[PDB]
């Protein structure tokens, strides 16, 4: 994010995660209903995401080795 209306300049990291979804045709009617989404993240949210996912991964590994 180099610049914006309310600030002339900066240099801030930003993320744009895009994903694809397939829903069962029955649950939406007669349509295939395949949608795409986009979420714009920041540093703290990404860090929390990664910490939680790493915690889950460590749990899985411990279960595997136990």
């Amino acid at each position: 994010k180099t610049s914006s209306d309310s600030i002339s300049r900066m240099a801030v990291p930003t993320c744009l995660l895009q994903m694809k979804i397939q829903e069962d045709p029955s649950l939406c009617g007669d349509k295939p209903s395949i949608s795409a989404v986009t979420v714009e993240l920041s540093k703290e949210t990404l860090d929390t995401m990664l910490d939680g996912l790493g915690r889950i991964r460590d749990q899985l590994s411990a279960v595997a080795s136990k």
Binding site: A11, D47, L50
Partner: protein, 174 residues
Amino acid sequence: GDSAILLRAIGSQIRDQLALPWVPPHLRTPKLQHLQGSALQKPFHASRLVVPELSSRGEPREFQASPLLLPVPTQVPQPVGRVASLLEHHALQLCQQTGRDRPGDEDWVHRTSRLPPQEDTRAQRQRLQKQLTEHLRQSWGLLGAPIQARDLGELLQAWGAGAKTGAPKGSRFT
């Protein structure tokens, strides 16, 4: 008459329609389908239509006399479209007629005696257009403007970009 004759006709029609009993739709001839249902009712839609004009001024007449210009009623596939478009075309033509040569009343035909073609009317609508254009001329400086701020735009070009990133960086998950 009509206030009673209309009632008599309505009563006769109701009696005749009551005479026919009810039949399942699967065994319905088109007449009954009209009577005991509305399955075969189409909507009203009008499509733009072009007609030849009795004006032989030149080049366009070549198109008007060519097979490229199909006959007016057959310019659309469906007959309902044909009838609807023709009816609307006639109504619009008559409306344009109403604002044109019309043998009207003792006073409405008064202007028709000496009216130039859309010229004598221009003097008293030029006043309205004067108000329109003078209202437009305002607000281009009345408020907010002047907006002359040629300081934020081009100065950035001189300085350019000073800093930049280096080598790919990474770390160990916490």
